[PDB]
Design a protein around this ligand. Sequence first.
Ligand SMILES: *[C@@H]1O[C@H](CO)[C@@H](O[C@@H]2O[C@H](CO)[C@@H](O[C@@H]3O[C@H](CO)[C@@H](O)[C@H](O)[C@@H]3O)[C@H](O)[C@H]2NC(C)=O)[C@H](O)[C@H]1NC(C)=O
Ligand SMILES: *[C@@H]1O[C@H](CO)[C@@H](O[C@@H]2O[C@H](CO)[C@@H](O)[C@H](O)[C@H]2NC(C)=O)[C@H](O)[C@H]1NC(C)=O
Ligand SMILES: [Cu+2]
Ligand SMILES: [Cu+2]
Ligand SMILES: [Cu+2]
Ligand SMILES: [Cu+2]
Ligand SMILES: [F-]
Length: 497
Amino acid sequence: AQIGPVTDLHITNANISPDGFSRPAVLAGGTFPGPTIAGNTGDNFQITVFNDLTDPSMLTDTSIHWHGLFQKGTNWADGPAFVTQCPIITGQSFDYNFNVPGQAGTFWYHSHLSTQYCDGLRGPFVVYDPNDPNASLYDVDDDTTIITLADWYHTLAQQEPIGAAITADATLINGLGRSFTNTTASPLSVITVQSGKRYRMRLVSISCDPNYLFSIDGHDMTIIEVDGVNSQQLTVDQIQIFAAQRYSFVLNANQPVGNYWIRAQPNSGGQGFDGGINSAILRYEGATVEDPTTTAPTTFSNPLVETDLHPLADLGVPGQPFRGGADDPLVLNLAFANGRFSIDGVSFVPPTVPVLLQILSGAQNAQDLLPAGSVISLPSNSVIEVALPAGAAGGPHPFHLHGHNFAVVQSANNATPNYVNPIWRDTVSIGGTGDNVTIRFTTNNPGPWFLHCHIDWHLEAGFAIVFAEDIPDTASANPVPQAWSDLCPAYDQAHNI
Ligand SMILES: *[C@@H]1O[C@H](CO)[C@@H](O[C@@H]2O[C@H](CO)[C@@H](O[C@@H]3O[C@H](CO)[C@@H](O)[C@H](O)[C@@H]3O)[C@H](O)[C@H]2NC(C)=O)[C@H](O)[C@H]1NC(C)=O
Ligand SMILES: *[C@@H]1O[C@H](CO)[C@@H](O[C@@H]2O[C@H](CO)[C@@H](O)[C@H](O)[C@H]2NC(C)=O)[C@H](O)[C@H]1NC(C)=O
Ligand SMILES: [Cu+2]
Ligand SMILES: [Cu+2]
Ligand SMILES: [Cu+2]
Ligand SMILES: [Cu+2]
Ligand SMILES: [F-]
């Protein structure tokens, strides 16, 4: 069952074995991935998060972010630790009480403290549209049509040794999959369809790191949504999906009744499908209960290319149709050296006082805000452009902005910008060496919004800044509940800060 939009959500420690290997985890709702949180566009979500964590090896504090939901007027509910709140301590709870006006699509929720989401605190978050303009393109859209892609590690996130390369041990599709080494024939996920019907498959990357080449043998996929933004129909036979991105695609159950491999090839970790790694099963009703015998092509015919996507609505691009044609045009210097990432020379280290609380306490320019050099002010009611030139090690880096989606004026691997009809989204690959991926948005959401790489290991190593959007109006725009005011005193007392 889906839960919400008003629900409790308990965060616990438990053992799981999603690839046959047992390890402790941090779970929402007792499962990996967590249960789907759902409602309709415009609903009031009231998610009372109970922190019941006791195992310090995965941190006993927590904080949860509702990835891709704008939180206008509720910045305090956004979740990034030390950006919008202090963490919730064990034995306490916190009500994330917010609304989702003007948004409908496929989202997710995840811990936003340290690398804790990698230890298991990740799940889907769907905001349905009772008047969805795409409704007539499919028959079925429910919990059974959500597809999550996850990296899974045998080593605990806090225990990943300093100076050793971090790669995953299994790809999990809907929570199940097989380990890349010492592979055992543990159960694979099955996604069931009925011959003749059409499905809105909601593909969610809950990855901490790898991007996946996602495909379904014998089938193609008609993209209708990108990171919450309705798109024109785009038929592809493979989707490269980066950490934290989402697509909805129409799957037409138009192949012979049978079993077909679902493939999700990560860019690191195990390569290929030996022993059924990187795999799940598409099973038609009435098919034999057996593994598929299908194969992938050597070369896919119609891979997704991001510049092929266009909004369903006439979204345009704000500003003027040339580089720098914005009220506040930025170019960020994104670098890596010696184990740390930096943005314009500053590596992000979370501050003791959350940025939002610093602002509410009267800090009124970004030079006054901690961490020094990590908080950049944005002016209100302005077109912002951010160029994100690639080159830093560990790419391709999927950058994400809280509080906003954005026009992708320039995409990976293509030097030509698009000032007419590019897709809008919230997480974008910045590509490869010499690329100049560039985003645009307008500032109509006062508050501190995190901009960061969504490879969690990179975020932890400093690949972030905070955009303090409209500092002057942040306090008036975001009244805070007493429970939020109580978070930092409780956290600092428990931690003897
Ligand atoms: C690299 O990125 C650019 C910019 O996003 C892509 O250019 C765009 O390509 C499309 C598809 O060919 C062009 O639109 C087409 O416009 C013609 C009118 O000439 C119309 O008849 C077609 O039906 C279609 O809509 C679009 O104008 C063009 N935009 C720009 C700014 O150049 C390009 O395709 C990407 N390269 C690759 C290899 O995908
Ligand atoms: C990415 O695009 C930005 C503009 O959006 C480029 O920024 C210019 O950088 C040069 C120095 O390299 C400056 O003289 C200009 O003032 C910048 N702004 C402009 C022209 O609008 C940036 O160089 C591009 N980066 C790459 C790697 O292509
Ligand atoms: Cu987010
Ligand atoms: Cu996120
Ligand atoms: Cu990164
Ligand atoms: Cu985030
Ligand atoms: F977000």
